[PDB]
Each structure stands twice: as C-alpha cells, then as structure tokens.
C-alpha cells in the first residue's frame, strides 16, 4: 500500500498542531518525526515530550524515526507519548534487535529498522525474517543529518533488493524525495515516501502529495 508521510522536520515547529492537521487535510497518510540526539548525528531536533504534546491534538499515524544512540531507552517514553511507529537504526541496534523489536511491538508500536547509506543491505534480512520481525525498513537516501541534501539514486539498489525478497514489506525512503525523484524510487519498490522541503516548500503542497501517491500506485 502507498504511504506518503511528510517530514514534520521541514515544518513550522512553532505550529506543529497546525502543520500536522494541515498535512492530513492535504492527504498526509503519516507524519514523519525525526528524533535526533546530536550524538548519533551532529544534530538535535525533538524528543518524546514533543511527540506527546502533539498526540493530544491529532490521531494521525506518528512515524517515529529514532536517530539516537540509546534507542531502547526511548521505547518506554515514546509509547506513552503515543508514537504509532518506532523505527531504530541497525548501526546502534547491533545485538538486541531481537529484544528491541519485541519491546517496541509489545508496546503497541509498529517496529521498524533503518540503515545509513554505507550499510550493506544484507544486514537487515535477519531482522526482516525473525519470529517477531520489524514491519518496515527505512532506507536513508542521503547522509543523515539535516534536511536538504542530494538524493542518492545508488541507494535504490537496496530498495529493489528488499522488494524482491519481500514483496509486501513496507519500504520507506527518506531524503530528497520529491517529484523530481519519486519515480526512480517508485519503480525500485519504495511505497512509503517521506517528503520534506518538496512538500513544505511547495506552492501546491496538497498537489505534491497527490503526485507522490500516483507515482507509487502507477507502479
């Protein structure tokens, strides 16, 4: 199924409640929340508290991308906060993915995993195949850090690879996605698109979302 989740990171943070409600109105399936602690990536954005306050205003799906080092330590707070999706990083999740995916799941959150550009795609299959597996895989399409970097087409090799072995797994692409790049990723197998400036900086935001969706469905 197609899923177009705007990256609230490129929105008016002073007006999350507003922005969030406006994206659904325009077609937002999910709301992509990037939580960074400045240690895993040279940048600190938002944490649990935020997520929580936002849940008191919208019932939308909150896709939480955990770019932190101590993810296990966020599972409890984010759950309470009301996160819908919890996605961790294979890099720091080495050696507990099995326990982690279970903690996440047992909290009512859809567990997911992600891998930076330079991380062999193979590394997730084990996590995608486990008894209690992740239900989504996020493929970083740029070096994780700040919004506005150049889309990396090479990363598409990972999308196709995934899509082949797993025909119905939600595959998410995050970084640079927009009209100009949606197609190359749509054909690769991505069905969960995260858009940032391509939406919050468009004259026709609603339109843009409607275009990312078609792309994916026309695939």
Which residues would be at the binding site for a second copy (CB under 8 A)? 9, 11-18, 20, 35-39, 42-50, 52-54, 56-57, 68-70, 73-74
The answer to whether 199 touches 174, Cβ cutoff 8 Å, is no
Q: Binding site annotation covers 170? A: no
| Residue 187 to residue 157: CA distance in whole angstroms | 11
Burial 172-211 (b: 16+ CB within 10 A, else e): bbbbbbbeebbebbbebbbbbbbbbebbbebeebeebbeb
| Active-site residue flag, 174 | yes
Rounded to a whole number of angstroms, the minimum distance from the CB of residue 17 to a second copy is: 4
Q: Is 89 one of the binding residues for Zn ion (CB under 5 A)? A: no
What's the gap between Cα 81 and its chain centre?
17
Selection from Zn ion, a second copy, none that 73 binds (CB < 5 to 8 A by kind) is: a second copy
Q: Is 174 one of the binding residues for Zn ion (CB under 5 A)? A: yes
Selection from a second copy, Zn ion, none that 72 binds (CB < 5 to 8 A by kind) is: none
Residue closer to Zn ion by CB (options 63, 211) is 63
So which residues are the catalytic ones? Answer: 34, 174
């Amino acid at each position: 199924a197609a899923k177009i989740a705007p990256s609230m990171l490129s929105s008016d943070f002073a007006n999350l409640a507003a922005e969030a409600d406006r994206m659904v109105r325009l077609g937002a399936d999910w709301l992509h929340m990037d939580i960074m602690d400045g240690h895993f990536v040279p940048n600190l954005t938002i944490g649990a508290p935020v997520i929580q306050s936002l849940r008191k205003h919208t019932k939308a799906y909150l896709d939480c991308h955990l770019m932190v080092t101590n993810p296990s330590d966020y599972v409890e707070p984010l759950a309470k906060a009301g996160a819908s999706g919890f996605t961790f990083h294979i890099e720091v999740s080495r050696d507990n993915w099995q326990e982690l995916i279970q903690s996440i799941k047992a909290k009512g959150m859809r567990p997911g995993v992600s891998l930076r550009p330079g991380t062999p795609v193979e590394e997730v299959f084990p996590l995608v195949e486990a008894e209690n597996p992740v239900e989504l895989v996020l493929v970083m399409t740029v070096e994780p850090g700040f919004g506005g970097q150049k889309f990396m087409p090479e990363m598409m090799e990972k999308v196709r690879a995934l899509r082949k072995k797993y025909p119905s797994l939600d595959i998410e692409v995050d970084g640079g996605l927009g009209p100009s790049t949606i197609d190359v990723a749509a054909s690769a197998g991505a069905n969960c698109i995260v858009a940032g400036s391509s939406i919050f900086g468009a004259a026709e935001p609603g339109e843009v979302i409607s275009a990312l969706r078609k792309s994916v469905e026309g695939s």
